[PDB]
Design a protein around this ligand. Structure first.
Ligand SMILES: COC(=O)Nc1ccc(-c2[nH]c([C@H](CC(=O)N3CCOCC3)NC(=O)/C=C/c3cc(Cl)ccc3-n3cnnn3)nc2Cl)cc1
Length: 238
């Protein structure tokens, strides 16, 4: 997160830190709890990941120092990547991780509400990008979960800012025309949470951008309202 501040413990209880074991343990991506055995993250997070066996989900974490050999986690039973996903810059940069065990909801961890089918009509003023990502393009993973308020940008305006790209309606952009606040290396997969009618909704998944918080370069997210059916099809399998 560029131009953010430290979170208060329990602010984003749906927020998780997805770690890899191969070769060494280290943070891989962000993610969101959407069900008692479901985490929604970015499909690009599993580039090169050959087995769910090397993954660990840590919920109820404010600081990365909280993760030690004795820290409890969730094992990944299954990695479900959107089967139309080729690359972040094309879209379908969404994946589900089915956990081996049940997340027990409490004061440190709970799910985030997905956008409703009728929520496509609403305008979001209160949106926030969260992660343990870099504060700048050449940095390191942050210990304390940063938070940043970013305005949502139109498809038309985002398309103007990304000449040479193809900004689909399956994509959602957020940025200040002058930059300063955005997501960065280490934040992907993580949420773009919007508070509407005093309820937080998972409006986006941190995906890609050209550099970090550059003027006239909004960060691009997976427009989650366009994937509610896929998420339900994959989480609600008979
Ligand atoms: C000790 O542990 C560690 O050090 N762990 C560690 C873990 C992961 C990373 C890391 N993560 C990423 C991914 C892309 C990726 O993982 N890949 C690999 C797979 O193919 C796609 C790229 N991008 C993002 O997360 C966000 C992009 C972004 C998003 C928005 Cl909204 C706006 C601007 C954005 N940025 C434009 N440039 N930087 N950020 N790159 C790096 Cl490098 C670095 C370190």
């Amino acid at each position: 997160i560029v131009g953010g501040t430290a979170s208060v413990r329990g602010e984003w209880p749906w927020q998780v830190t997805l770690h890899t074991t191969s070769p060494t343990q280290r943070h891989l991506c962000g993610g969101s709890i959407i069900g008692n055995q479901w985490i929604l993250t970015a499909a690009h997070c599993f580039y090169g990941v050959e087995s769910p066996k090397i993954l660990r989900v840590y919920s109820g974490i404010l600081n990365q120092s909280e993760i030690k050999e004795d820290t409890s986690f969730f094992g990944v039973q299954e990695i479900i990547i959107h089967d139309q996903y080729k690359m972040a810059e094309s879209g379908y940069d969404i994946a589900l991780l089915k956990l081996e065990t049940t997340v027990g909801y409490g004061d440190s961890q709970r799910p985030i509400c997905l956008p409703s089918k009728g929520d496509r009509n609403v305008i979001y003023t209160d949106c926030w990008v969260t992660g343990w990502g870099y504060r700048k393009l050449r940095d390191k993973i942050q210990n304390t979960l940063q938070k940043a308020k970013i305005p949502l940008v139109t498809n038309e305006e985002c398309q103007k800012r990304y000449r040479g790209h193809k900004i689909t309606h399956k994509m959602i952009c957020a940025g200040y025309r002058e930059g300063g606040k955005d997501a960065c290396k280490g934040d992907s997969g993580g949420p773009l949470s919007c508070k509407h009618n005093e309820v937080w909704h998972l409006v986006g998944i941190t995906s890609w951008g050209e550099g970090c918080a550059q003027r006239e370069r909004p960060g691009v997210y997976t427009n989650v309202v366009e994937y509610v059916d896929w998420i339900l099809e994959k989480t609600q399998a008979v």
